[PDB]
A paper describes a structure:
Striga hermonthica is a root parasitic plant that infests cereals, decimating yields, particularly in sub‐Saharan Africa. For germination, Striga seeds require host‐released strigolactones that are perceived by the family of HYPOSENSITIVE to LIGHT (ShHTL) receptors. Striga hermonthica has a set of SL receptors, among which ShHTL7 is by far the most sensitive. High‐resolution X‐ray structures reveal that Triton X‐100 specifically plugs the catalytic pocket of ShHTL7.
We determined their structures by molecular replacement, using the ShHTL5 structure as a template 21. Surprisingly, in all crystals, ShHTL7 associated with the 4‐(1,1,3,3‐tetramethylbutyl)‐phenyl hydrocarbon moiety of Triton X‐100 that we used during protein purification. Triton bound to the deep active site pocket, formed by a double V‐shaped arrangement of helices α4–α5 and α6–α7. The hydrocarbon moiety of Triton established hydrophobic interactions with Y26 (loop following β2), L124, F134 (β5–α4 loop), M139, T142, L143, L146 (on α4), F150 (α4–α5 loop), L153, T157, L161 (α5), T190, I193, C194 (α7), and M219 (β6–α8 loop; Figs 1C–E and EV2). However, Triton remained at a distance of more than 8 Å from the catalytic serine S95 in the active site. Well‐ordered water molecules filled the space between Triton and the bottom of the active site pocket. The Triton polyethylene head group protruded out of the active site pocket. Five ethylene oxide units were visible in a relatively weak and poorly defined electron density, suggesting weak association of this moiety. The headgroup‐ShHTL7 interactions with the outer rim of the ShHTL7 binding pocket comprised a water‐mediated hydrogen bond (from the oxide of the first unit to the backbone nitrogen of E135) and hydrophobic contacts (between carbons of the first unit and a hydrophobic pocket formed by ShHTL7 V138, M139, and T142, and between carbons of the fourth unit and L160 and I218). In ShHTL7S95C, the sulfhydryl group in C95 was oxidized to a sulfinic acid, as confirmed by mass spectrometry, causing only a minor rearrangement of the H94 side chain in otherwise identical structures (RMSD of 0.108 Å).
Numbering used by the authors: 3 to 270
């Protein structure tokens, strides 16, 4: 079953289901500090996206997972398998964008989207600043495969905004390097090539955008942009955190913020 292949875990109890979708380089273990604050009030569904190191490499389709849509379609199937409707979806980076795309096709499945550090496009254009220049990205990606570990280690302290020897770093690297190398490179290239901007106006479910004040992968203005271009109601909350995985590195600040967005609707 697709849910078995995605390591679906179900906990808690309640009329409303919260779905937790981890971001690049992590797995559902990233949510371990949030869960205790949900278990008494909600049913919670956790899953691993295909290609996480905890998933079977034989199920990784390099054609489907070279664009984000494959993840969105897979998300729908998982929610259907466990008969999940009008969920509160909480995602980090790519998973939040995957859910946003999914919600265009199946708005019935989503009550709201809570999005940690989302970005619809990394590469800069004349009109849009994503934080990365095409010609530099082209050089970096040309030698990505042979340099995956060294490039990833070398950048991770600034990506996470924490020291190379920190507990948060050790945890991130544990899951990042759990991915099979070819799979990791495929997912990395997919993220680097994202352009979800054409979808945004067609997203109508409520979106809660949670950002760090400084994130090398998400310029702070991307949050304000998300608000201006999403088709439904949205809220933007910039936190006094640094780093792209503030739920991992700064949970004392980030968990209370995430909880507020889960618990409090901006509609009805």
């Amino acid at each position: 079953s697709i849910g078995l292949a995605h390591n679906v875990t179900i906990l808690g109890s309640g009329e409303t289901t919260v779905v937790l979708g981890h971001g690049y380089g992590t797995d559902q273990s990233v949510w371990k500090l949030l869960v205790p604050y949900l278990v008494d009030d909600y049913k919670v569904l956790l899953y691993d996206h295909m290609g996480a190191g905890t998933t079977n490499p034989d199920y990784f389709d390099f054609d489907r997972y070279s664009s984000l849509e494959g993840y969105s379609y897979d998300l729908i199937a998982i929610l259907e398998e466990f008969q999940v409707s009008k969920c509160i979806y909480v995602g980090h980076c790519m998973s939040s964008m995957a859910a946003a795309v999914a919600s265009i096709f199946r708005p019935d499945l989503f009550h709201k989207l809570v999005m940690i550090s989302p970005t619809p496009r990394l590469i800069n254009t004349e009109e849009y600043y994503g934080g990365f220049e095409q010609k530099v990205m082209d050089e970096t990606l040309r030698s990505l495969d042979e340099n995956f570990k060294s490039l990833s280690l070398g950048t991770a302290p600034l990506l996470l905004a924490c020291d190379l020897e920190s507990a948060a770093m050790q945890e991130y690297c544990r899951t990042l390097f759990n991915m099979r190398p070819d799979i990791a490179c495929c997912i990395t290239r997919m993220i680097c090539g994202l352009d979800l901007r054409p979808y945004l106006g067609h997203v109508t479910v409520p979106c809660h955008i949670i950002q760090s004040s400084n994130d090398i992968m998400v310029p702070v203005a991307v949050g304000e942009y998300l608000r201006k271009n999403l088709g439904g109601p949205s809220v933007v909350e910039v936190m006094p955190t640094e780093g792209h995985l503030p739920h991992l590195s700064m949970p004392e600040v980030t968990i209370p913020v995430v909880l507020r967005h889960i618990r409090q609707d901006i509609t009805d």
